[PDB]
Design a protein around this nucleic acid. Structure first.
Lengths: 176, 198, 98, 125, 96, 32, 93, 204
RNA sequence: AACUAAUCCUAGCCCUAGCCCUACAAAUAUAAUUAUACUAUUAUAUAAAUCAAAACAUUUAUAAAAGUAUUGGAGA
């Protein structure tokens, strides 16, 4: 309903609105799967109204009453998602053993780095997908020089780090 | 960035540490979490300062500067309410105390006794005085919002106490999405065709 | 930047003894930032040197330069603080020493 | 739902159902002059007008007659202390006309002594 | 939807999401919780915990009874493939 | 302060390990 | 130019610290140790100049030989170019 | 954090002719019903607070604080007076040099009335001759005479923080009796400005 | 005691020693960063010259024996 997008008529003009603590993760875990789905929308509805009220406050150049309310709802909403995700993660691992919901693998880019490549579903297979074959997952021979530079760069960073520590040590003696 | 009495990110802090400021940094002796023994609400005796020798309760701790703030102690005087119409009213303004400038107080005997950190049967770390060994319990501090949990009265949109504590989850081999389907009876018989992931 | 002209106005002399003549009052006033050329302002300053408070105000009122208007505001401010803080009993009894 | 992956559809594939919605919308007082039945909404840029129609009809049980949506460009003229351009987040404004003859009006949210000066009044001397 | 030839839009009903809205009537869980309500000690659910809570009792009872075999592992809840379910754990085929 | 002990070298025969990468080739020769 | 308007804090240095107190000890290891260990053996520093000294070109050339294989490719190329200038200056001027 | 509270809990009403004035001492006993219960509250925390002996201790603080003005001993004056009193004493003395002296008290100081997390305010009656001369920034004399004694009777309120173990009596406020004469006028002459009006407006 | 100005100490760096190493979502090589088909898909030659030979042409380095014999428009 339209009224749900707005605060209680009595609360209008109040400096703050009395609200309690946000939902904790354990309490949401105690709640049932169906309850969690129901709660998310209930949490969301308040968030939209608070967001709805906040935008009107921005239009009016006015403060939002009890801004902590929005943070509490977001904390409750965020806690719900992890609990739901945790249950999904546990079942996924048991039935399939996969630690990631989406298929993926470690692949080497043209720069010689090793990065996790998330597989994409396509209507056609890779071998008949010329564009996918056109995509480059191989490192050129010249990247060996870059790899040596990367190792040298890491060593340089450590050397600079020691220099940074040395200057800090000087002032410690000066200060104390 | 030099940490000050002003909270980081505040208007005073921004003036204290503007983006272009490159002042000679102040060095603070690092203190480990185990090493640190001063917490808000702890009764401590000021070793040195304006109010040296006066025991006070901590109200703010800037661990970055090893600063402990005691309300109504180490106090200099400033004017509140200075305006065109009125000169202003003098008030008490506290100054930070470094960690070495205070020491913990043994409850039974009020003295600045050096303390050593040791665990208890429950496993909670508790400070123990090096001499006249005794347990200094962690002090009780009111909630920052000022809300006493039990005294709090539920307002609009607030779940009652029992509702939050109720447990309805039943361990089963079904996700939230699957469980929602059973309760609301969502059924889908269509099937995606073979998809080549890559 | 140096602001020693104000500090000259903060000078406090020792209490005069009963058998000591009343010290003539000295007021130091300045406007640090003016979007105007000093040379043009100097010409106005040079003419008004040594004149009385009332005479300077009258001359400035009919001056066409923008700097003269600024000086009049500065002069009026100096006169106000002189009576308010420097114990100038008579408004007319003021002259431009420098 | 925004910032999430949606299943690819093939012939005969399952109907797309979003059981939990990440779309968050804000009702805003009309900046321009609009009919009373028309309602403005600030919505995520990835939401479709059909999604809003389904969103209002299902989550909020609001009957909708017509929907008009516009994208407002966020000003990038502003620059920080480093002279780096700051871009205002782009937002989508949705004009929704209610059905069933319903009408909407934005609620009114946020309805010493002068004779003796120089001697402090403290002095009795 | 899909755009056909001549750049004419043809909405695909399947690809248009349907918002499944829970029934919030009579539901005691709300945007906020009382400051009165004590927090619970976090015990996140994991594959081992889910197996212990749900799968372990069934196998334990069957093993003592002797009616356990590799062929009936799916009876205790193993899914050889995720295909056929509206919500597939891997590959993920459903929106949140 | 007390001066540190005078340096003392390891005495007696020392046979280099052929497999060790660090050991130089000349230390593994029959002449060695 | 302009000069500091503040005086630096006073500093006190101990001349009898162990390093200064024991500086030079065991410098007679060879004569007092039966010459088993030469004082040159007591030098600790860059490998290519331990117990050895030479002109800038000789020091650079010796440095290249000692750590040429363990030097960076960029450094080795720079060292090669630097050696060229040093060689020409000393050997042609 | 506040160690003092502005204002007086209950303002004691001085009777005309008290300067001419046993007698007044008995009035406290008659009014002790109103104040003695308060006196007990100060006594409970201290037990050494007596209306007879407090004025001597109170008198020293009053004189000492005034002495700090001559030397501009702000740090010393802070302890003597409460936070409320401090600005009043020194605010109008800015950029001024004052020679202040205390002549022998005309009559003995006596506690008059007291009131009281808990802040106790004690009203003390003081009639004393004092010499005051304030000079300009340039040293010109602007108020008072260097060595002429002016007899003034006033009621002075001191305050203490009863709850604090280290709480002590610090000068807080002064009650001026209505029958007291006006203070000496400034040497210089002031002008009351006339009404300021816009061109179309007319004189009022 | 005047305006313009000036004042300061750490931001960090440098060289050796030591040590090798084996550590959000979303979008993307299509037109990179464009949520799904198109169109198959891809780096690297003696290192040279400059330079030295006062030009230029073969030529011109980049533990002791020893900068010696040899080699070289026998010249750098």
């Amino acid at each position: 309903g339209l009224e749900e997008f707005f605060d209680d008529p009595k609360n209008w003009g109040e400096e703050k609105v009395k609200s309690g603590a946000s939902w904790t993760c354990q309490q949401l875990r105690n709640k049932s799967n169906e309850d969690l789905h129901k709660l998310w929308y209930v949490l969301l509805k308040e968030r939209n109204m608070l967001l709805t009220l906040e935008q009107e406050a921005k239009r009016q150049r006015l403060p939002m009453p009890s801004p902590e309310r929005l943070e509490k709802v977001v904390d409750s909403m965020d806690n719900v998602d992890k609990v739901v995700q945790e249950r999904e993660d546990a079942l996924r691992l048991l039935q399939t053993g996969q630690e990631k919901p989406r298929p993926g693998a470690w692949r080497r880019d043209i720069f010689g780095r090793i990065v996790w490549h998330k597989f994409k579903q396509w209507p056609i297979p890779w071998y008949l997908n010329k564009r996918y074959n056109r995509r480059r997952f191989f490192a050129m021979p010249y990247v060996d020089r870059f790899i040596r530079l990367r190792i040298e760069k890491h060593a340089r960073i450590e050397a600079r780090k020691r220099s940074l520590q040395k200057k800090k040590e000087k002032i410690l003696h000066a200060k104390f | 960035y030099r940490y000050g009495m002003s909270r980081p990110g505040s208007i005073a802090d921004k003036r204290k540490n503007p983006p272009w400021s490159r002042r000679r940094p102040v060095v603070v002796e690092p203190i480990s979490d185990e090493d640190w023994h001063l917490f808000c609400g702890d009764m401590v005796e000021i070793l040195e300062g304006k109010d040296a020798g006066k025991q006070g309760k901590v109200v703010q701790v800037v661990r970055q500067r090893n600063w402990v703030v005691l309300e109504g102690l180490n106090t200099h005087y400033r004017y509140i309410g200075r305006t065109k119409d009125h000169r202003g009213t003098m008030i008490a303004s506290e100054a930070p105390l470094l960690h070495h400038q205070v020491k913990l107080v043994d409850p039974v005997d009020r003295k600045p006794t050096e303390i050593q950190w040791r665990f208890t049967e429950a496993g909670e770390r508790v400070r123990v005085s090096t001499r006249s060994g005794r347990i200094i319990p962690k002090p009780e501090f009111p909630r920052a919002d000022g809300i006493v949990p039990e005294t709090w009265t539920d307002g609009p949109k607030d779940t009652s106490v029992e509702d939050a504590l109720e447990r309805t989850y039943v361990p089963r081999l079904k996700t939230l999405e699957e469980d929602v389907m059973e309760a609301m009876g969502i059924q889908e018989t269509r099937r995606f065709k073979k998809v080549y992931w890559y | 930047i140096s602001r020693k002209w104000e500090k000259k106005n903060k000078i406090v002399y020792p209490p005069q003894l009963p058998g000591e003549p009343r010290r003539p009052a000295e007021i130091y006033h300045c406007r640090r930032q003016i979007k105007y050329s000093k040379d043009k302002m100097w010409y106005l300053a040079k003419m008004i040197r040594g004149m009385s408070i009332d005479q300077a105000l009258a001359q400035l009122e009919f001056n066409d330069k923008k700097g003269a208007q600024i000086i009049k505001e500065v002069l009026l401010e100096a006169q106000d603080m002189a009576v308010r803080d420097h114990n100038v009993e008579f408004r007319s009894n003021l002259h431009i020493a420098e | 739902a925004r910032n999430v992956l949606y299943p690819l559809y093939q012939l005969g594939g399952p109907q797309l159902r979003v059981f939990r919605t990440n779309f968050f919308i804000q009702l805003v007082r009309p900046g321009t002059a609009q009919p009373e039945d028309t309602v403005q909404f600030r919505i995520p840029m990835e939401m479709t007008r059909v999604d809003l129609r389904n969103y209002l009809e299902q989550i909020y049980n609001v009957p909708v007659a017509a929907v008009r949506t516009r994208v407002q460009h966020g000003s990038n003229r502003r620059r920080d202390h480093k002279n780096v351009r700051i871009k205002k987040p782009d937002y989508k404004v949705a004009y929704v006309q209610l059905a069933h003859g319903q009408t909407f009006t934005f609620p009114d949210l946020f309805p010493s002594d002068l004779r003796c000066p120089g001697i402090p009044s403290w002095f009795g001397l | 939807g899909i755009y056909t030839s001549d750049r004419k839009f043809v909405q695909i009903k399947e690809m248009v999401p349907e918002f499944v809205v829970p029934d919030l009537t009579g539901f005691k869980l709300k945007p906020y919780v009382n400051y009165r309500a004590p927090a619970g000690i976090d015990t996140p659910l994991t594959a081992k915990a889910l197996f212990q809570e749900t799968v372990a009792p069934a196998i334990e009872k069957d093993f003592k009874e002797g009616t356990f075999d590799a062929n009936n592992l799916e009876k205790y809840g193993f899914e050889p493939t995720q295909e056929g379910k509206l919500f597939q754990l891997y590959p993920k085929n459903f929106p949140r | 302060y007390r001066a540190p002990p005078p340096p003392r070298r390891r005495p007696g025969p020392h046979s280099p390990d052929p497999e060790n990468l660090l050991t130089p080739r000349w230390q593994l020769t029959p002449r060695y | 130019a302009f000069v500091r308007l503040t005086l630096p804090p006073p500093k006190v240095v101990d001349r009898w610290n162990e390093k200064r107190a024991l500086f030079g000890v065991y410098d007679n290891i060879g004569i007092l140790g039966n010459f088993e260990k030469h004082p040159k053996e007591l030098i600790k520093g860059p490998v290519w100049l331990r117990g050895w000294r030479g002109n800038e070109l000789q020091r650079c050339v010796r440095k290249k030989k000692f750590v040429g294989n363990r030097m960076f490719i960029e450094d080795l190329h720079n060292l090669n170019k630097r050696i060229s200038y040093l060689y020409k200056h000393f050997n042609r001027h | 954090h506040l160690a003092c509270t502005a204002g007086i809990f209950d303002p004691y009403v001085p009777p005309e002719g008290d300067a001419r004035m046993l007698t007044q001492r008995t009035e406290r006993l008659r009014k002790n019903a109103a104040s003695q219960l308060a006196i007990r509250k100060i006594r409970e925390f201290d037990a050494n607070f007596k209306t007879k002996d407090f004025p001597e201790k109170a008198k020293d603080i009053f004189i000492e604080a005034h002495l700090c003005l001559n030397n501009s001993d702000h740090d010393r004056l802070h302890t003597l007076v409460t936070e409320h009193c401090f600005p009043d004493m020194v605010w109008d003395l800015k950029y001024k040099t004052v020679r202040w002296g205390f002549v022998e008290s005309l009559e003995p100081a006596q506690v008059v009335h007291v009131r009281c997390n808990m802040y106790g305010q004690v009203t003390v009656r003081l009639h004393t001759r004092q010499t005051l001369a304030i000079y300009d920034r340039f040293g010109r004399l602007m108020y008072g005479q260097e060595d002429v004694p002016k007899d003034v009777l006033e009621y002075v309120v001191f305050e203490r923080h009863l709850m604090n173990p280290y709480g002590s009596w610090r000068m807080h406020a002064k009650i001026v009796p209505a029958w007291a004469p006006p203070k000496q006028p400034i040497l210089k002459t002031l002008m009351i400005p006339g009404p300021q009006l816009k061109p179309w407006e007319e004189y009022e």
